[PDB]
Design a protein around this ligand. Structure first.
Ligand code: GST
Ligand code: GST
Ligand code: GST
Ligand code: GST
Ligand code: MG
Ligand code: MG
Ligand code: MG
Ligand code: MG
Ligand code: MG
Ligand code: MG
Lengths: 274, 274
């Protein structure tokens, strides 16, 4: 039944994201469950590309499942698809950003170099802003057009934050999301990055991206009054909690070659939102 | 004196390249010493970018030295510059490919993705074909125009060979020279490459590049009669010796994630050339 299939998706979000489970547990019942289902879609697709043994074939098999899903002919016992089917039934979810999300996951299948900041935003749009777009009909039922730009920019904001915390982790998987033009601008070589060096040039480049993330966070938060009241604390809380990763890395002297917002800090952000 | 400064450059080539020291020891005295000096220039610049701690600044300091060298005002005790200065005095060396070589070394300073085969040839031209061009006035004094295309293609041939043997070694330094379009064409993912997988798709892609190298080797060898007699065995020998790396990897079942032409095989190639 629906409660079991949603409970499965609740287990996924609570296992993989402390920040987003605590934010979204504050939504009303049916919005919260739909976000759980939307989350499990995103998290499966990202796990295929980033952690599956055969990512080209697994993701293509995942997208075919979604084509069948969207045509209402996917018949299965998989709780995530049963939860998503109700969510799509219960709220006017748009499939466009769901597809766009898969197009973004495709980008991580083969070697790519981010050259410019726009390259970076293009990537961030497809793997993170799309998720913002998937959620808006649940979060802002009648006001999607009024809040869409801020949702997109909140996407940029959090993906850059995640990239900025995961520099070493991404290097060890032979991924670089730092724009090459910035590395040239600040004199931070690939040899420097290979030697996991935190010098003044690295900090300059990190801070330049971090301030971009911060402007986007600010834009997104400026749209929070346009959300319905029940969405303001979960959306605002999730943003501030994730934004707090940046300052965490600052207080740890930018050591991103070995970072969590603390549980207590997370609660402080929530309480301030309340 | 000159004999000491050339003897220093002889020590460099014999330490770093079995293939090219044995080929070029067969040249007459003054051609052989000049090749030694030309070799030490190339090998210093490549060592800066690939093994220096501060490659942006070291290579720029190396290029400034060469600007001063070319204006005849570099005064030093460094044997490699004293050997190169005679070589430039003794033979009509062109500085154009020497500069182009540094432009090619610049490319390895920051993250880059080879997208297409032309990307690859562009890179190979600047780091390997230029070396062919540096050598031609010593190897083919009056016939540079007649043999230049083959020298360039011999460049392509050997750089691809080197890339093709060094796939794992280059991966561990966070370098990928495989064109991304080929990985897409043959279904060889970045995850596959990260898992150092030698599957049928990897072999298909490897063999496609290997046949390109082989066509270029064939073109270059077809120009060998246009070289003067004393250059035919060293140029032909060096090419066949380096080309033999490809078949070596074939006989080792393409295991390039852990390959040498044997000493005895090297001698067989030389004797056949003689
Ligand atoms: C679906 C919602 C609301 C949030 C999660 C979206 C999702 C699946 C993010 C993948 S997070 P993660 O693997 O930590 O980040 P990346 O390295 O893939 O860029
Ligand atoms: C919540 C709203 C309004 C927009 C969300 C934008 C968003 C959730 C981008 C992905 S955050 P990510 O770090 O990728 O996912 P987790 O580490 O929390 O698992
Ligand atoms: C100067 C002559 C005739 C041959 C040597 C040219 C030279 C310095 C090649 C560098 S070889 P190597 O480091 O093994 O090859 P790459 O990985 O740099 O592409
Ligand atoms: C000898 C002629 C005519 C053209 C030479 C083209 C050439 C030497 C390209 C570099 S071979 P490389 O593998 O880079 O250098 P080593 O491993 O032998 O040190
Ligand atoms: Mg991902
Ligand atoms: Mg990921
Ligand atoms: Mg990450
Ligand atoms: Mg090199
Ligand atoms: Mg090298
Ligand atoms: Mg190599």
């Amino acid at each position: 039944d629906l409660n079991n299939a949603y409970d499965h998706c609740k287990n996924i979000i609570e296992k993989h994201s402390k920040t987003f489970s605590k934010a979204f547990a504050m939504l009303p019942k049916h919005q919260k469950r739909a976000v759980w289902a939307i989350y499990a879609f995103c998290r499966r697709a990202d796990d295929i590309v980033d952690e599956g043994e055969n990512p080209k074939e697994e993701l293509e098999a995942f997208a075919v499942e979604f084509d069948l899903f969207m045509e209402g002919r996917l018949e299965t016992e998989d709780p995530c698809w049963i939860a998503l089917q109700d969510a799509f039934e219960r709220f006017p979810l748009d499939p466009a950003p769901f597809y766009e999300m898969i197009v973004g996951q495709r980008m991580d299948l083969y070697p790519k170099t981010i050259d410019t900041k726009d390259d970076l935003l293009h990537y961030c749009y497809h793997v993170a802003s799309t998720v913002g777009l998937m959620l808006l009909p649940v979060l802002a039922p009648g006001k999607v057009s009024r809040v869409k730009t801020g949702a997109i920019e909140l996407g940029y904001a959090m993906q850059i934050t995640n990239i900025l915390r995961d520099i070493g982790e991404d290097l060890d998987n032979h991924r670089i999301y730092i724009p090459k033009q910035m590395m040239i601008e600040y004199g931070y070589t690939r040899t420097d990055l290979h030697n996991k060096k935190v010098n003044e040039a690295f900090i300059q480049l990190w801070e330049d991206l971090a301030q971009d993330a911060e402007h986007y966070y600010r834009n997104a938060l400026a749209t929070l009054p346009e959300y319905p009241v029940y969405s303001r604390t979960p959306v605002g809380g999730a943003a501030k909690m994730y934004r707090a990763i940046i300052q965490t890395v600052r207080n740890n002297d930018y050591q991103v070659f070995g970072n969590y917002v603390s549980d207590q800090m997370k609660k402080q952000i929530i309480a301030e939102m309340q």
